[PDB]
Every structure is written in C-alpha cells, then in structure tokens.
Design an enzyme around this catalytic site. Structure first.
Site, PDB file in Angstrom:
ATOM      1  N   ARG A 138      24.423  17.105  27.352  1.00 58.58           N
ATOM      2  CA  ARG A 138      25.077  17.404  28.642  1.00 58.58           C
ATOM      3  C   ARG A 138      26.448  16.698  28.767  1.00 58.58           C
ATOM      4  NH1 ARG A 138      24.029  14.181  32.544  1.00 58.58           N
ATOM      5  NH2 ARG A 138      21.769  14.090  32.207  1.00 58.58           N
TER       6      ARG A 138
ATOM      7  N   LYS B 215      34.433  37.301  30.850  1.00 59.95           N
ATOM      8  CA  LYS B 215      35.252  38.519  30.876  1.00 59.95           C
ATOM      9  C   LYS B 215      36.050  38.626  29.568  1.00 59.95           C
ATOM     10  CE  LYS B 215      33.518  38.705  35.064  1.00 59.95           C
ATOM     11  NZ  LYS B 215      34.257  38.367  36.302  1.00 59.95           N
TER      12      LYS B 215
ATOM     13  N   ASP C 183      43.484  31.095  38.731  1.00 55.04           N
ATOM     14  CA  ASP C 183      42.424  31.835  38.098  1.00 55.04           C
ATOM     15  C   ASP C 183      43.129  32.933  37.279  1.00 55.04           C
ATOM     16  OD1 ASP C 183      40.383  33.623  37.392  1.00 55.04           O
ATOM     17  OD2 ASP C 183      39.336  33.515  39.356  1.00 55.04           O
TER      18      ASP C 183
ATOM     19  N   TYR D   5      38.805  37.241  44.293  1.00 53.98           N
ATOM     20  CA  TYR D   5      37.535  37.604  43.692  1.00 53.98           C
ATOM     21  C   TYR D   5      36.391  37.287  44.679  1.00 53.98           C
ATOM     22  CZ  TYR D   5      33.300  37.198  41.045  1.00 53.98           C
ATOM     23  OH  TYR D   5      31.963  37.303  40.621  1.00 53.98           O
TER      24      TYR D   5
END
Ligand code: NA
Lengths: 377, 369, 370, 377
Positions: free
Chosen positions: D47, D197, D172, D100
């Site tokens: 992690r 994406k 973004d 978005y």
C-alpha cells in the site's frame, strides 16, 4: 526440512533488490543483455527460461526431493515431453491397463502412428509387468492410484523390473501428489504431475510438471520444453506456485473427508462396492499403506441399481459439482463411463457404467455427507 | 469489413449476461454441466478465453478456423505432427527461423522425417526439392534475419501440382501486411509473441486455416499434447491484436526511415529491407505485402566487432532477443546460430519500434560513431 | 451450511452460459447496454459495480453471515469509507488505546483536521468505554484481538453500550477472521477486514471489506465506494476469493502452530512474557474463549534482554521472514517499536505464525535465540 | 526525448538481475528487510509503495514532464485525494459549470457535507472565473475539453488567476491525455487523469493519477494515498503502463477519425449541431489550437429530431458500442442526459436530451462512417 515448509520457502527466496516475498509475475518475453551474450541471471528468452517459471520449477523439484524440475502448459504436455524424450521409432512402452484416458489416447492414437509400440498390463501383477518387457522396451509408465478405479501399483517393485531390463520408470503422481507419495525415493526415474489437479488445487490453472534426479534426462526434457515450446505463462505459473503453498494442508483434509465419505457410502444400501485405497478390503491396500502417507481425496463407488442410479446420483448432488477434473477445494462428481472412446476396447479395461467418481473437497464433512444422503434418496 | 475493425470487433461479442466489452479471463479448468454449457467441459480441450482469441486470429487472416498455442514453436510442432508421419518429407527454407530449423533437424529427423532446405526465391529449385514423399512445403517470408522474400502464390501452385500442403510462417509480416491464405497457402502460422501481442509480454502461437479437416487434425494435437495458452496470456494476446494495424503502419514508416539513414551511413555496407527497390525480391514483396514491415538488417563495413559494438552502444534500441515490440530491439544473430545459409557475423538485426523516429536515428547515429 | 462450505460455494455459482466453476476475471471497465439504460445483469460501469467484485462481495458477506458486503482497494480504504459514511464534522468516535497504527494515523492525522474528534480507551474496561461516550459520539471503533498486543474486547458488551447511546459499533475483525469470530452475531453494526491478511492468506493481494446487515448503512458505503472510487481490480478480487476458499483450513493450522510457538516461548529463558489469547493467564482470555472459535495465529513476546535481543531474534530467524504484514501462509516476524496511544514496548517481537511444519518453526526460534 | 519514446522507455529500466524488458507484476503485499529497517530498494509494504506502482508512477510523471507521479484505484480516487489534500473545512473551490458528472457529484454530495463550498463558473470567461474567487478559495478545478460538451478553458489564463490569489490550479487532462495537452507547461499546479480512459486505452483497467512538480504537494498526496489506501493492484498498474506505450500512436488516429466523423455529421441533415474542438466554429477553437497538439477523439452532436432520435442513433449503431466510458480502441456511444443526475439543476449546465456523445475509436474510418450512415437512416 518438512514438506509444508519447503512448499512455502524453497525455490523462491525474497528478492535481493526489493525483498518481494513472492515470486514476481515476469510478463516479459525477452531480457536485456550487457555487451552481447552478457546475460543477466542467465535469462535470454522466456520460452527458454524465465524467472517465474524457474521459481515454480524449483518449488516443484523441492517438494519431490528432486534435483531437477520442468514446468509445462498442461499435464498432457509434460507427458508428451516425457514420451518424446525417452522413446524413438521402434521402441516400446509398458503402460497401465487402466491408465488415465488422456495418456492412453496420446500413446494409442498419436505415438503408434510414429512407430512406437505399447503393451497394457495390470500393474499390480509384477510377473505380468516383467513379462510385458521386450528388448525394445525403453519405458514403463506407472500411475498409482489409477483414474478412476484407484488401483495400486508397487512403485519400488516396478522400479526394480526397470533397472533389471534397462528401462526407465516414470510415475504419474497426480492423484497422490507430493504430499502423499514420493516416487523418486522408491526408485522411479521421473515423476509426472498434472498440476491442474491437486497442486494448483483450485480448478483455475492448467499445468504440468516433470521432476527427476537424472541430469541427462532433465537435459532431454529441457530440449523439448524449449524446442517444442509447451511452456506455461507466468500468471499461471504463479497460481500453480500459490496453490502448492497449501498442498500439504489441503491433502490432509481431503484424505480425512474422503475416508468419511467412503465409510458413509460403504454403509449405504444404494452402493455395491466402494473403491478407496484406505479401506482394508481394497485390493492393493497394503501396497498403498507402504508407499503412501495418506490415502487421498478420490473415492469411486459402484451403484447397486446400475447406470441410471449412477447418472441420478451425479444429477442430484448440490455441493458436489457435476464437472470433469479433480483435486480442487470444491468437491466434484462425474460418471466416467460417459467419456468412453470405442477405440479403447481390447486395449484398456472397460470402466463400469455403474461407477461414479467423487473428488472429495475440503468443505465441511457434515455438508458433504448430507448432500450424498439427499442425492441418494 | 476493414482489418482494424475486425481486430477489435470480431471474435468476442459483448456478453449477454453482463455486456462486458472485453472477453473475460476464465481462470477455470473445468465447467459445471447439466449436457454441456456453451460447449465447455475441460479447459485444455476448450475454454471461453481461448475461443475468443481463436476467433479473433481467424478473423484477421480471413480464415474459417483458428487454433491458439502456448508458443510459436508449439504451433509449429502441432503443424508438423499433424501433416507429417515417419517416411515423409518437408521442403524448408535455406534460411529458416533458427527455432524451426532446430525442431525439424534435431528432433523430427530422429522420428524418420526428412527435409531439404532450398532458396525459396528460386521456384525451379523449390520444385526440384519436391519428392514423392514430400507432404509439406514450409514457407517463411520475409525470413528471420535476412528478410529474403518467397512468392507465396507461386509456391502454392507447386504444392497443388504435387499434392503437398503449403504452410506460411507469417510472423514478420503479420496479418496487417500479408494474407497468405488469399494467396493459396493451406495454413498460416504465427508466433503471437512478436507483432500480434506487440508488447514483448506474452509468449504464444497460432495456426489458422480454411480446411476443416486440417483444423480437426490440429485440434486433436492441441487437446491431446496440450500445448495450450493460459487465459491471462490469451487475453494479452487479444489486447495486443486490437492495435496491430495501427502499430504495423508506424513500424513500417519508422523502419523505412531507419533503412534510409543506414543506407547513407559509411559504417554500413549493405541494408536489407524489403521496401528498398534494390532488395532482392522487392517486386515480389510489393505484390503480396501491404507494407514492408518493421524489421531492418544491416551488414557492418568493419565486420563482427563493429556489429557487436553497435549492439552494445545503443540506448533506445534494447539489446535483447525477440522482435515485433513497441520497444525497439537490436541483436547480433550470428551469436544465436551445410544445411542452412551461414548468417554473416557482420550482420545486425533491428526490430524498429514505434518510438519517435528522430530519437531512433539519433540513437543509431551516436552508437555508430 | 458450514463455514468452509460457504466460503467455497456461496457467492459465485457456476456460470449459466459456460459453467465456469470459478468467478471469471472481468477485465472490462464498461458494459454494453440494449438501448439506452437496458442494462445486462445490472452492469454499467466497473467502478460502480462489476461481476468479479460482486462475486467477492457475496463471498465476504456469506462468511460473516451478513446480508451486504463491499470490497475496497485496501483495509485502510474500507476504514476510510466507514469513517466517512458514519461521521461528519462535529461528531466523535471512541477508539482503542492500542489501535492498529494505520487506523490511528488516519483518525488522528487526517480526520481531526476535518473536525472529527476521538477518545482512545482501554476497550477491555467497559466502564471506561461507556464514560468515553459523549452526546456527539456516533461510532465506537473496536478491534479484537489488537495489533500487536493481542488485547481482547468484549464485543457483545460494547454493542450494548452502542445501542444504549445511539452510537454504531464497528469491529475490525482482521486478526480473528470470519473463521474465528463473527461480530455481527454479537451485536456489531459493521465488520471491517483487511483482506490483505488472513482472508487473502498469501501476502499477494492488498484489499479491504465492509460487511453489514443494515441496508441503509450498506447504501452509505456504496455511495462512497462508487463516488470516491477506492475499488479493487478484478485480478485482485479473484485472488482474494481464491484465498478465502482455504481460510477455515488455514486458520485451524495457524491456531495450532501458534499455540505450539506460545508454549515453546513461554518455557524459554530469553522470553519474559508471552502474549497469546489462548493462554489462561492472558488478560481477556475468558472473553476470548466466549467469542472466538479459536485463538489465532498471532503471538507477541517480550524479550528479557530488551530491544537489542528483539532486534537480534528478528534478524536471525531463517523461516520466519522479517517483514511487515501478517496472516500469510509464510511465517512473518517484526519488531513493532521500529499521549494518545499506548507505547508498544521496544522489547516486543510480533510473530505471525504460518502454516509451515511446526517442528521447523520451533527449531528456527531455538537457533535464532541461541 | 520525444513523448512516444518516453512513454515506452521512461520509468522502468530493464532489471539488473534478469534484464526483463517490462516492469514485473509484483503480487506481494510485503517485502523482506535486512535486520529491522534495512529496507531493500526502499520497499516495506505494498500500500505504501511497490515496484509495479513505482514504475507506473514514473511513466505517468515522464509523459507529463512532471517530477512526481501518484497512481490510484480510479480517476475518482485521484480526485478525492486532490480535494482532501488541498482543502479543509471552511475552504472553497471554483469548479466548471459543466464538469464531469462524477467530479461534480463528489464535490456536491460528499464534500459540501464536510463544510467545503464551491462555485460553478463558465471556465471560458476569465472574468467570471476571477469573480468566483473568494478569500477562502484554495483550489480552481479546470477540465478541458469537458465531458460531454467539449467546452474549452484557457489553462494559462486560469493559472495566472490562481497565482494572483494564492489558489492552486488542478487540470483534469483525461480527455486530451498527455499526448495532446501538457497542463504543467501552462502553469497548472497538478494534473489529474482517469487512466481508465485513453491512457489504459482498452476499456480494461480502472485507474487514476495525479502528477505535479511541487514536492510538498506530492507529499500531501502520498500521505493520503498511503493513509486512505485507494491504490491500484499490480496487474492493473501493468495494464495501465501497457496501454500508455501506445497512447501517442492511438491519440493520432483517434483525432483523425474524430475529425472525419465530425465532418460527416456536420453535413448530415439529421444533425443540428456538432461539438468538436477542431471545428473553427466551435466556441474556444482558438484556445484549443493554442494549448492542444491535436483535437482529440470525442465528438458530441445534437439531433434535429430530439431525444427520441438521439436514443435511436445510440441503439442502431453496430460498430459504436452503446456503453459508458470513453477513450478506448473500440468506438463507444452514449446519450449523456440519461446518465446525469437531476439534482445538478441550478449548479451545472443541463446536458441537452438531444445530445449524443461519441467516443471515436481506431477502427477503419470508412466502417465508422458507414455505421453512422446506416444508423441515422
Ligand atoms: Na507468456
């Protein structure tokens, strides 16, 4: 030292660079070199060798107390490698009369076309095994317990026969696994596994293995592993290795659950005969007790009321899954006579059509017994 | 209809139950029955991820049938064993891929299969090598590493005339540049390790055919000898395939630029690239290939040592075996080798990747000195 | 019916179309629809839901006898979801005085900055737990046994305190696992796991889980699972499920091996104190015996010769691997020390006892201790 | 040096021990140490950090010419981390008026409950952006082109407004990708991607990223990456790196194909309006031309015959797949007003119900145009 420990620790040591406790998944087909033929760690091309496969090979060898291990894309690919390494046209192989169907099909339908001959024998009868040995016999193919009748072969006894006639002895140790039987300690030259079954343990990775102490044999296998290229991918090699870490623990539970299922079915009026190596009345029980640490997770039974009753039992279980394969955490059931090829008549024993094969998993035993009780009505 | 479209769309249809746009990775060795569900019984025999990969492979070669294998060499092994028996003969290239030559010469000769190597460019020589026992002609074009060219349609005719099957190893060209079945070949082989996967991360092979009986002979050996791919690897192979058309276009553009740079450079004596009009077999290449590929081999003026040093000194071209990756690779083939042509020890093989071409030419310019 | 059976069978049923026995790995971020909003199987966008995660969530819920399960990218992401779902600025949480250091870090170093307050308490003292409850307390955070001291908390008793004050009770059940302890049956509202540890079992997948019977709480969790997107990938979710299939079997051998290690170390003169829930003299043993089916695979010890002896033991073992984490088949060992929380003594060594042959484990400790 | 080259080569160097050309998949949660705290390669717990994530983070940072990269389980987890790192109760964020939907839902439905405030603004109007800045504004959230309306924001202009008021500026960059737009070069403090994406590119891995040149900001992100644990698995990190290797090549074809689709649709009588940054009539075209290297793969169109025509077009395509998401090699189509949440009314622009969003893939353009022609009737 102990097998559970080796299955976890042998053949991957935590990486020097990162300390990663598990063998990484090397999804690389090729490996950068320094100066030219300056290989890094001996790696050059993944089919030839790659680090994830090396780790699996080392773990496999370790759990059979073998010097050498080789991993393949399937049990059948391992068998094909063994046959092609040890035989040439004009040679002969002695095989079981109730071999694994896939092995029988590879030898009878493929290798006979390449001028290899075979003789099937009842491997329990050492005089018959010896009598089947010709001057051209280069290999004796042992499987014990057999799939599906769970018949037993004396590995040390057969190894002696091979030594006396300069024939190599291969043991397909898939059903017992390393956890229960160690054929190299009994004189076998090579051990085969389908790691698809107990070693992976989770019905999620197809794979095979060959292990030996003979360096020249391991070289002959490596030439075909590289040359014909039936090699596992690294994600699959990782899943096989992952499964192997719990093999000892799983086999113990498998054996315990199977013993309970065999006793239940032995008491049940729908069942004529129970085939389980741990039963004193099972033919070859004393041999099994001498060469196996435990009696395994496989039980077969014959139904008093015949083929329909067998099919009904297979249809009505709700925890035993009606599916092929074996050696999974999940219980599986099948009706092996359904898989009969016509061609095997005369060359292999007929599997009775009243027979059901149970691969007993590691579910709670009470649920397994309740499932069989309801299925049997 | 178009090949890029088919690579992306043929084969797997989004699933009825979930609509997942990609073929799922079925890490299952066995399949619950009722008869079978979907026709699946045991993963070596067949499984859904391999079915998807086989359908995509067949689609891009306009073939009716596809078979996927654990490696290119496993696909070759399946082809040889399906089409040959003891006493039979195979005509092979005189400069075949070393793995194929090794398998045929070191393994199959021991099983009473005979072979004759031939310059495939010389159709009279190919025909003359055909015996009454010849059951297969083994075609590779362009060849690895010399990039020699074979007339597939002309060899296909020879096979038909003598009842010998013709296999084409289409690894270097890939389906995006060459479609041997449309030229008469009976079977096409790929190492999908190379351009199909495209990313040097999955070893795999394929055989594709229109001949239903021949595909059954292949299936018998795929299932029976079990040189089958795992589902994560078949996924990666399928993933790679979705960009093959776009990648091969850039490979070819970048290779052409490399070949021209090296043609003009004094450290280089000869350039081997199918797109050069002076390359032997260029006109044949132009007739049967949509583009001339990503591979360029060169011969160094100053010999073996200059070949070794070029390979050592590149910083973008990676010194490694294999080819057909997004990352440019470089090797000295003579360090990896009467029955085959001797690969000259001054030859360097370049697998030109999809990096920016100016960076590749700069990398070669600094390494060459 | 039985837990080992449910671990294998609940959750994914063999697929209708193919019969695949295992849940497929759906490496798809999106799902084709039949007309706009004609979903197939309810699936639309992987972060929101996907078939491999569904399968894992069903298995996780089944093994805690829970109606609802949610899977996350790590144990800490499950914790973060629980805290964000159940608290807002101004609210308070009662926490253990020897919580998992990650949990304590998240609450003390992040959530205090967002106007959440906390009080650490010795969970074993129910009067002290109750006294720590304010009018603003919305959550009591229970961990039992604790990491690394293996202290025990009475889940049912704390549950009652939570009910009495309208505060929800979460139990971090990572160390015990569903095979040993079932906090929802004792009155907890929510159970958290780091599946990284025992459930995965093989130190190869980082993951977390929340399970509940409260549909409203599950919806609050779902909102943040989707909206903040701390979601597992499908390969990882498959590995987690695969591990779970052997959990019951592994925890039995972990417990057996650990008891043997505790006994060995209890008899060894280099060891001052042994911390193991199974010892009758361990504080909280009787509570542990009431709420746990077995005493687990963790053992902590205090070294007579202090911090340097603790360092030496960690360095000299050859089977126990010196590494962080716990709950693997492979034995692990660490020196945890290397006003708001209890100080972990610097003479303490934490052992995650694995499933190796017990004689090999005892021989490793014997040689390392010299 | 060139971006395609960096995407392939930056970040992971072939391994010294094995030369593996690709970053291995390290499926290990933990790493062996030498004596307590003697870390190997700095690795301690997955992690916190692991070698496959490191390699991905290095590649992501390289392609944005950034000094620091951080990888997350999703784009939304990257967004969550940025917001939590850069905001506290009492602070304010300026956001797009047509963001978005996921980003807006997180801010409006979650962060408002933690006493963060926001103001939505037309990012194209720099006066309006400036006017929305309060004394408490700590962050300006820029998305360009926007999802689904493809509106354009002047990154350099907005960066200046943030510098003037000591507010950080996040871009973004998901739709443009690093191949087409480099916001750190234009003054942004942080760049976010959903790597689900275009970067992954194959609709098969969910992931996110933050990249920056500010070491203190990267530390603040790390604290939350490690602390809240929204971190990617190694398989997924590997697929994201694999996709990145072909980003530059794919984005070129996406842009070519998209331009052709936009021209086709602009000439078609069923279409009222075409939204594509490359059209000289598109609002913000000159800003896009100035800050983008190419105009991207997304095209939205408004249907003359309204909502039902939009639904029909989506249902009738056979190459464009009706699914959510975008940035894949396979063409995707959606009707975004069906995906929007009603409670955005008043705080975000309404997505017209006649609008169809096309994610144009890399299939052959003639087949894509044929598909639209047949579907439109
Ligand atoms: Na591979």
């Amino acid at each position: 030292a102990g097998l559970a420990t080796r299955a976890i620790h042998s053949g991957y040591r935590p990486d020097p660079a990162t300390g990663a406790v598990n063998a990484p998944i090397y999804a690389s087909s090729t490996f950068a070199q320094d100066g030219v033929g300056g290989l890094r760690g001996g790696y050059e091309y993944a089919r030839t060798g790659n680090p994830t496969r090396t780790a699996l090979e080392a773990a496999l060898a370790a759990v059979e107390d073998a010097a050498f291990g080789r991993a393949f894309s399937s049990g059948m690919a391992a068998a094909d490698c063994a046959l092609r390494a040890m035989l040439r046209p004009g040679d002969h192989v002695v095989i079981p009369d109730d071999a694994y169907g896939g092995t029988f099909r590879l030898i009878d339908k493929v290798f006979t076309g390449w001028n290899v001959e075979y003789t099937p024998v009842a491997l329990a009868d050492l005089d018959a095994v010896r009598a089947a040995i010709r001057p051209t016999t280069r290999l004796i193919w042992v499987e014990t317990p057999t799939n599906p009748l769970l018949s037993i072969a004396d590995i040390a006894g057969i190894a002696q026969l091979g030594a006396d006639s300069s024939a190599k002895v291969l043991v397909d140790n898939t059903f017992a696994s390393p956890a229960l039987q160690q054929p190299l300690s009994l004189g076998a030259d090579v051990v085969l596994h389908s790691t698809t079954k107990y070693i992976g343990g989770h019905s999620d990775v197809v794979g095979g293995a060959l292990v030996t102490n003979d360096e020249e044999l391991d070289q002959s296998f490596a030439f075909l592993q590289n040359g014909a290229g039936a090699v596992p991918g690294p994600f699959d090699a990782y899943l096989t290795m992952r499964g192997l870490k719990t093999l000892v623990l799983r086999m113990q539970r498998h054996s315990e659950n199977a013993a309970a299922v065999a006793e239940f079915l032995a008491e049940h009026p729908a069942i004529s005969t129970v085939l389980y190596p741990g039963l004193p009345s099972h033919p070859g029980h004393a041999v099994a007790a001498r060469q196996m640490r435990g009696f395994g997770g496989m039980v077969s039974v014959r139904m008093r009321a015949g083929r329909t009753a067998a099919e009904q039992l297979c249809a009505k279980t709700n925890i035993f899954i009606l599916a092929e394969s074996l050696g999974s955490v999940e219980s599986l059931i099948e009706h092996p006579s359904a898989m009969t090829h016509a061609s095997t008549a005369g060359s292999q024993l007929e599997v009775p059509d009243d027979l059901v094969r149970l691969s007993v998993g590691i579910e709670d035993v009470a649920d397994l017994l309740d499932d069989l009780k309801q299925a049997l009505g």
